[PDB]
Amino acid sequence: MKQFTKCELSQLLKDIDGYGGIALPELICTMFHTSGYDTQAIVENNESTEYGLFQISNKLWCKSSQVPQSRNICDISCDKFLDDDITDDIMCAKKILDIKGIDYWLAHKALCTEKLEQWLC
Template identity: 40%
Template sequence: MGKSVLFTGFLLVFLGLALPGTQAKVFSRCDLVKTLRGHGFEGFVGKTVADWVCLVKHESSYNTKAVNNNGPSRDYGIFQINSKYWCEDGKTSGSKNACHISCSKFQDDNIEDDIQCAKKIAREANGLTPWYGWRDNCKGKNLSSYVNGC
């Protein structure tokens, strides 16, 4: 039994090392606050980190693996970036791929590329209006609870 447990442990560690970046991550609220602050989101396009955290909560529930099928296109990752305009998923006809990236890159635990594309979207829109989660749940509301205690 001891050898079996040791081998299983070794196998799990090996698989974890052999498949880097393939694991999803569900952020805690405060981890996301810290990450967004560290990437200059406070005041970016005139919005607060609380706006962005609220957006992410309502778009993906802080889950980097989230996918939402909208019929002819899909939304990917923690920011729910759309395949019709921003990334290429091989399924969406006529994708513009304005962020020049595969949508699958938005589904791993590394959100650096997600952040770059989300900022591009927000910059081009001059705000967060492209995200229904923000428009329907966050816009014009007191969002202090999204950053309190962090």
């Protein structure tokens, strides 16, 4: 259920290259192994769930019925991360990068800090 090509995502996110010292291919890499470019991706964990192209968690970042105690850092309902517009998802991902850095994503150190030429367009 890929909803983007690696190339279209690289073009849409072109100005996020360098953001907090992030290389763009590093990020695209991270997004692919995270969500498979599926804007509707839902990953269910123990106490919580991660949503969308960026797999943003309801534990901290958005408001959801599942975690009423969430601080909702991005000030947004998690449902917004399952629509076809990734603009709000990108806003939140940047807030994550501003705080916690690219290591929020467990795919980044696992696969995206080494051998990245396949993520170029």
